[PDB]
Amino acid sequence: MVLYFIGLGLYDERDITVKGLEIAKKCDYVFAEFYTSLMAGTTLGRIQKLIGKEIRVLSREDVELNFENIVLPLAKENDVAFLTPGDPLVATTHAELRIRAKRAGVESYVIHAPSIYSAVGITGLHIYKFGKSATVAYPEGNWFPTSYYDVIKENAERGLHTLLFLDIKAEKRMYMTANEAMELLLKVEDMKKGGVFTDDTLVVVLARAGSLNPTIRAGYVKDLIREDFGDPPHILIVPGKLHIVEAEYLVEIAGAPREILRVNV
Amino acid sequence: MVLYFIGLGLYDERDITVKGLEIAKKCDYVFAEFYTSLMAGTTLGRIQKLIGKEIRVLSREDVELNFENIVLPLAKENDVAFLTPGDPLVATTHAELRIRAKRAGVESYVIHAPSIYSAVGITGLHIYKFGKSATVAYPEGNWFPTSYYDVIKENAERGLHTLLFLDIKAEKRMYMTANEAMELLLKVEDMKKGGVFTDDTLVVVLARAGSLNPTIRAGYVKDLIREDFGDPPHILIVPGKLHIVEAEYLVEIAGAPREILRVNV
Ligand SMILES: Nc1ncnc2c1ncn2[C@@H]1O[C@H](CSCC[C@H](N)C(=O)O)[C@@H](O)[C@H]1O
Known part of the structure; x- marks a missing residue:
């Protein structure tokens, strides 16, 4: 029933906030996007290791065209995290995803980062x-x-x-x-x-x-x-x-x- | 040997980045100021507990007038951190404090936060x-x-x-x-x-x-x-x-x- 937009920060896997890391660890499913920007000082493997969860990477089309078919369904009956480089919602297209969540009957919360x-x-x-x-x-x-x-x-x-x-x-x-x-x-x-x-x-x-x-x-x-x-x-x-x-x-x-x-x- | 400017984030002690926490935990002396902004979801005690160090709070006068007399001296023989709400260099005049550090022969590093x-x-x-x-x-x-x-x-x-x-x-x-x-x-x-x-x-x-x-x-x-x-x-x-x-x-x-x-x- 909950979707968490969690920022990964500026450069490496330790740029996520303590709040974001702990919440991500408790989520049943963890998605991430690396098309708005990249995390140049780390790797998907290093982020996965820190979170202790498998991370499914989504492309621009996965998000823009199918966010409600890939992410929201699971968020309906589980705690789901959506990771993004930097601070969530700084990228112009992210905000709208919260509206999709609302229309799907899914609650969303934003965990900021640098x-x-x-x-x-x-x-x-x-x-x-x-x-x-x-x-x-x-x-x-x-x-x-x-x-x-x-x-x-x-x-x-x-x-x-x-x-x-x-x-x-x-x-x-x-x-x-x-x-x-x-x-x-x-x-x-x-x-x-x-x-x-x-x-x-x-x-x-x-x-x-x-x-x-x-x-x-x-x-x-x-x-x-x-x-x-x-x-x-x-x-x-x-x-x-x-x-x-x-x-x-x-x-x-x-x-x-x-x-x-x-x-x- | 060094001085770290570490941001604590927007609302509570968990808004600090994992990077900032791991670094703060290992510092010898930890100072902080809480006059540039308000963290409405935590307390000094909770921040101290999280970092595992006694935090010495400085007033606006302590910083603006005596940063080089209270903080910098110690940074010359120890690893020192300076905590601030949000990001240490945003809408604060703290950036100038890095010049004081330099002129005092103290290397400084910045850890960002939401x-x-x-x-x-x-x-x-x-x-x-x-x-x-x-x-x-x-x-x-x-x-x-x-x-x-x-x-x-x-x-x-x-x-x-x-x-x-x-x-x-x-x-x-x-x-x-x-x-x-x-x-x-x-x-x-x-x-x-x-x-x-x-x-x-x-x-x-x-x-x-x-x-x-x-x-x-x-x-x-x-x-x-x-x-x-x-x-x-x-x-x-x-x-x-x-x-x-x-x-x-x-x-x-x-x-x-x-x-x-x-x-x-
Ligand atoms: N969590 C928060 N929620 C709403 N406003 C906030 C806020 N944190 C700071 N502010 C606004 O910013 C002002 C402090 S200016 C210092 C901002 C801080 N360096 C940072 O990077 O966040 C506050 O008086 C308020 O007007």
């Missing part, structure tokens, strides 16, 4: 200053999405920071790197000429948030575009005007140039 | 649509804060949602309710008259996020301003233009008026 949306606070940038968020998607065929460029423009215009989620081919386990993201943005700039993202733009890269050793780097595009930020996942941030306290953190903690103190404050 | 900033996903509103955030501060003396009103206006103009952190007076044990926040906004509206926040404005309230049964309610101010949302902490949200799926969730899960389903595109 999300990159909030973890970016480790960059030293004030969370309240983050504006609208966006995703940089790989272009392909004759399709070249550029909406994320406009998000940056509108946020920076109001002195706000822009969080850019980078594309990921979950099934193929291919992660877009911050370098690839910067290359694309310069390419979009060259096409839109809005002076939004250039070699002189200050950016912040956060890699492997959740790990005890994430890479946090800040600097101008011209200097970071070919820097090695380590293994995925990577997140790119284009900050707006900085509070001096933000700038000092970037310099002291993220190795940013002293120049940002006079150019971006 | 944050109210991302937990808002449970309201059904798309996280990427949230714009700048703000804090509704208690007026004091002849000083009546109003900056949060302009944040809502700017976000609403762009079709973005606004997350409003509500004030807290930890030592005085005062936790601002959504009702009180709504009252203050109506007053600011009377002054500025920007038509930003009125009796007809649609709002969303989230109370005690993190608990298994948080209060999630959506409706018009005139109808919710006197409603009982349960014990604090509370958060208030002023949605921008809604996607149909957001409206459906607000109606099905947050009990909003069915008329909002009819979106004005």
Whole structure:
């Protein structure tokens, strides 16, 4: 009669909360999805071992098209857990699943966990200053999405920071790197000429948030575009005007140039 | 040798991540602050019991004025942890404490935890649509804060949602309710008259996020301003233009008026 949406957190199998782990252990059935994002610092086997339960992985179609046929039936007469990377319901499509639960006569509860949306606070940038968020998607065929460029423009215009989620081919386990993201943005700039993202733009890269050793780097595009930020996942941030306290953190903690103190404050 | 900033999560002691617990358990000294937020479902004793260490609570003055005199000295010869509600670097000024650690020759690490900033996903509103955030501060003396009103206006103009952190007076044990926040906004509206926040404005309230049964309610101010949302902490949200799926969730899960389903595109 109960469905639990449990977040797995940021990077490895220990990023789940104590509450989530204990609840998952008591569930009769445990499902999971790894298409909204991945858990780069662990494996399905390591998560299964920690939970002590067999974990049935569901694809995007399994969830979007057949959630009520695969998960809800068992949730009708048993305690069922649905695991997702990060914090449940941050991914736009998750919320709706709670409605399906209601219509199936199944109760649902949400067990939160850290999300990159909030973890970016480790960059030293004030969370309240983050504006609208966006995703940089790989272009392909004759399709070249550029909406994320406009998000940056509108946020920076109001002195706000822009969080850019980078594309990921979950099934193929291919992660877009911050370098690839910067290359694309310069390419979009060259096409839109809005002076939004250039070699002189200050950016912040956060890699492997959740790990005890994430890479946090800040600097101008011209200097970071070919820097090695380590293994995925990577997140790119284009900050707006900085509070001096933000700038000092970037310099002291993220190795940013002293120049940002006079150019971006 | 090291200093750990470990988040405790949204509501109770089990909201800490497994990573944070295992690390805290092995630290020599454990400090904490409980003035940046309110964990309404636990107590110091329960947290102490879970971690198996005596937790020394620090006041805002202890931290802001003497963090380097109380915490850092020990971190030079021991493994020290600093616990905080939610995520240690979200809507707090704790990030700057990492600079003090550095300048003191102390390596610091951050362990994230569920944050109210991302937990808002449970309201059904798309996280990427949230714009700048703000804090509704208690007026004091002849000083009546109003900056949060302009944040809502700017976000609403762009079709973005606004997350409003509500004030807290930890030592005085005062936790601002959504009702009180709504009252203050109506007053600011009377002054500025920007038509930003009125009796007809649609709002969303989230109370005690993190608990298994948080209060999630959506409706018009005139109808919710006197409603009982349960014990604090509370958060208030002023949605921008809604996607149909957001409206459906607000109606099905947050009990909003069915008329909002009819979106004005
Ligand atoms: N569990 C909860 N439920 C509802 N609101 C919460 C909450 N936790 C925090 N808040 C809101 O956020 C304010 C504190 S600001 C600090 C937030 C904390 N660092 C975090 O990451 O969660 C509270 O006064 C309240 O307005």
